[PDB]
Symmetry: D2
Subunit: 102 residues, 4 copies
């Protein structure tokens, strides 16, 4: 009766800025379409303050993080997590009425 | 990646109590698990009073209503309709990770 | 714990082609991004066969149809209906864990 | 326009029965409404047998597991995880019509 097709997916976790400084980024440090540190760059003090200036409290993390395929990072808070799924939800009213009738 | 297993379904619509009184119900007149008048029975002034006392301004309407299998009624306002789907949304994190890669 | 933001919505209903011929379209007759008859045009035999050639068994109808704000049309099957909602579903894992903990 | 009222939630993960035997459970070992071993109890060879006989290859894991409040265990495979959200999806047809206009 209801099909749910995933078009995109993103995981976000709370930044711990005090642990990010000096890391070499293994994935782009980004939020809301803006990349603050490119993969392979070492995070500078300015990068930290640029995130802060923009009010970036959550950053993107690879979705694979949630199935254990990314070694855990001290610069995100493990007690947090926001999963955003963009989907096309197809609801058959006919099929629902048939569930209801039965 | 995401399955949506439907366990129950209903519409809800705003009630126009003036137009209900005197009619014979074609579906249970119901809200929040309480049935006020059963299908096949006449709606009394007492029923109308009970609905008002309980503050019932929306009632359940079968999803069949939306595909014409239950015919239209004056005492529910189609402009106000809601579809409530009770479901288990089964999200495969493995599948989402696969999609991300 | 879960927010569901609607980005787009479409209603589709099964076409009854035998009742569409000769109608003056009051909304574009379309499916899958292709407009077959523009609003205000009278539907010709060719339009019917063009829909058929493309296998168009369902057409778009204004969503308002489902709240009774479009007078019913004999050229769609009233016993049908497919509602497609494009949404951003935001799932707070933290909030869900808190529901679970409680 | 759409509210998603959560009524229950769990993860599920693939079980590695060899790594469970002998451990003391920190959450009920459970599938499809049957609890095999309660939180705080040791998993026996008999428990392992029961799981196998019932064909239980995925078990429930608390959502707390995903935010670190329940610590990681060798006997569930995080690569396989699912999140199952039981909810009432309340779709306002009035609101969808409003959005369409």
């Amino acid at each position: 009766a209801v099909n749910f097709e995933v078009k995109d997916q993103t995981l976000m976790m709370e930044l711990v800025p005090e642990r990010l400084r000096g890391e070499t980024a293994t994935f782009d440090i980004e939020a809301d379409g803006k990349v603050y540190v490119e993969k392979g760059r070492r995070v500078t003090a300015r990068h930290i303050r640029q995130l802060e200036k923009d009010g970036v409290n959550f950053i993107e993390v690879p979705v694979e993080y949630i199935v254990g395929k990314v070694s855990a990072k001290d610069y995100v808070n493990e007690a947090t997590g926001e999963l955003i799924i963009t989907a096309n939800q197809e609801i058959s009213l006919e099929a629902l009425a048939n569930l209801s009738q039965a």
